[PDB]
Write a protein that binds this ligand. Sequence first.
Ligand SMILES: C[S@@+](CC[C@H](N)C(=O)[O-])C[C@H]1O[C@@H](n2cnc3c(N)ncnc32)[C@H](O)[C@@H]1O
Ligand SMILES: C[S@@+](CC[C@H](N)C(=O)[O-])C[C@H]1O[C@@H](n2cnc3c(N)ncnc32)[C@H](O)[C@@H]1O
Ligand SMILES: [Zn+2]
Ligand SMILES: [Zn+2]
Ligand SMILES: [Zn+2]
Ligand SMILES: [Zn+2]
Ligand SMILES: [Zn+2]
Ligand SMILES: [Zn+2]
Ligand SMILES: [Zn+2]
Ligand SMILES: [Zn+2]
Lengths: 273, 267, 8, 9
Amino acid sequence: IRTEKIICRDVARGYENVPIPCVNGVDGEPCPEDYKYISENCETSTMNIDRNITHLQHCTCVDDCSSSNCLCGQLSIRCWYDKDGRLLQEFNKIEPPLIFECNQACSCWRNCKNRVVQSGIKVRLQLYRTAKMGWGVRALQTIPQGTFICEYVGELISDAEADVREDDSYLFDLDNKDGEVYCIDARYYGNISRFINHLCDPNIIPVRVFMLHQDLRFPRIAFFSSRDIRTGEELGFDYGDRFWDIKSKYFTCQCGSEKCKHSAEAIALEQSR
Amino acid sequence: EKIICRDVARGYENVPIPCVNGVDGEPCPEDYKYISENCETSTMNIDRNITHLQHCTCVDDCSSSNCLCGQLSIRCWYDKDGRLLQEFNKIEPPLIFECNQACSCWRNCKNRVVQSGIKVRLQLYRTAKMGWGVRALQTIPQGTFICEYVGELISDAEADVREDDSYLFDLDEVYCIDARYYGNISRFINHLCDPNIIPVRVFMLHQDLRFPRIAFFSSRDIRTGEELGFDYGDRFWDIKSKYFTCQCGSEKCKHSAEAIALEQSRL
Amino acid sequence: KQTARLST
Amino acid sequence: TKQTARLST
Ligand SMILES: C[S@@+](CC[C@H](N)C(=O)[O-])C[C@H]1O[C@@H](n2cnc3c(N)ncnc32)[C@H](O)[C@@H]1O
Ligand SMILES: C[S@@+](CC[C@H](N)C(=O)[O-])C[C@H]1O[C@@H](n2cnc3c(N)ncnc32)[C@H](O)[C@@H]1O
Ligand SMILES: [Zn+2]
Ligand SMILES: [Zn+2]
Ligand SMILES: [Zn+2]
Ligand SMILES: [Zn+2]
Ligand SMILES: [Zn+2]
Ligand SMILES: [Zn+2]
Ligand SMILES: [Zn+2]
Ligand SMILES: [Zn+2]
């Protein structure tokens, strides 16, 4: 019986608020090292993100930003975080709104109620070896619905550069429209999120968020739990059809859910009609 | 006599920075925006390309002389406690290259002092003759990082037309930090002709040589309650002495109305 | 597109 | 020299 070994004490090398250990109790694969862990997005060419402090929409709150008068809350109709930093039960989990967190131009304090993503990782996670899906990420604790988990962090690239990347297993489109659109590639540079698998029955959802800048080309991708998550559960999101339409020729979904849409069995049945 | 703001940084620093005034009726200064990191108000395109960072391959704590990032300043100037070495050149300091997100080392390596932020207890207080100042609320050994000179990044051309030139810090086609409208606790540090801190140029998350960050370290042991101050330099006083003279009160004062008058009688 | 993209 | 006062290292 193969034992579970701790093979890294912290894949983040102390860059996150908490350690993120790696274990393996399935095979002899060592800690993954074919990438560079970064805790914040990086650039490898000039993106000219608008960082002019005078361009920030900002609030005039002298509160903790829990009132309906916070301009930053109003930019998403309302602030969607409760007193504990969790999305409200009424949050649209299907088509999420764009969240504008408070920033350096607001009059409020750094610990106001509208600063959840910018405060970083608080839940305890683990990188671990799965049976059929390579590395994955699981919870080391219960996570209530609506809790911020982590951000999809990597290398900011253009749509045209994404189109010729040899490895297409870690590309996240920031915008689904035409024209001047950008992508996070977590292949070479990434954080823990690069290890999050696709699940046809997902328990986290990506949400576009603005913090220190409000350049609409460059939303940051924040994952929040979409339900209560039990200790030990693997984290997963729906990658979407812009992933599986290309990838299904190379491999099929191993998530193993009754709801699976992307397994060999699902695909063959749909072919059949 | 009265503690009048619990935290002038509104939670943006690692520790709170209280304001007190036991001298006069002046209210907590608020004609500026407190920011804990430098801001931009025009197109600057700081080079943040991760592939342009020089970086180390250390698997220890970057305490060895083999660390690439230490070698970029001949050696790392930080002791094991994060303080500048005794032999550090305080007259003409070197440029310090701290470790960064391209290095192999951990976030708590020994070459990460400035990027880790304020650790000492400071207070904004009312002085007798120099407006607001900053003092220590604890003993501070020599070489200790105090705080960074944070403000708005501007060009030399912009800095030359700024109407208030009391908060401009030259970086080195020089660029400048203007702390007048946006700044942190550093914008309240007064000039002393007997100084107890020194500014040092440092690189952390980027290495765009136009934009060193300005770090203050203590140049001697500092006692609780002592006012902090640095030598602003002659690029400041050559201009400003026409409008006001130094009030630091030192016997070494080189910029008082008296010192200036005594020199004018070079005759 | 020519490459697979995760997306919202 | 310059038109405005500048602090310096
Ligand atoms: C962003 S990565 C996730 C981390 C990956 N498992 C690893 O070991 O690096 C995405 C890749 O993981 C694998 N993967 C993720 N979800 C999967 C699924 N549901 N079924 C099969 N393979 C999956 C595929 O190789 C996919 O291209
Ligand atoms: C960077 S500010 C320091 C904070 C300033 N004392 C205040 O209350 O905002 C620089 C200005 O402070 C005053 N100042 C600083 N050091 C001084 C000194 N040694 N003598 C006279 N005035 C001084 C001058 O008005 C100078 O232009
Ligand atoms: Zn607000
Ligand atoms: Zn706000
Ligand atoms: Zn706020
Ligand atoms: Zn599936
Ligand atoms: Zn090193
Ligand atoms: Zn290091
Ligand atoms: Zn280094
Ligand atoms: Zn003086």
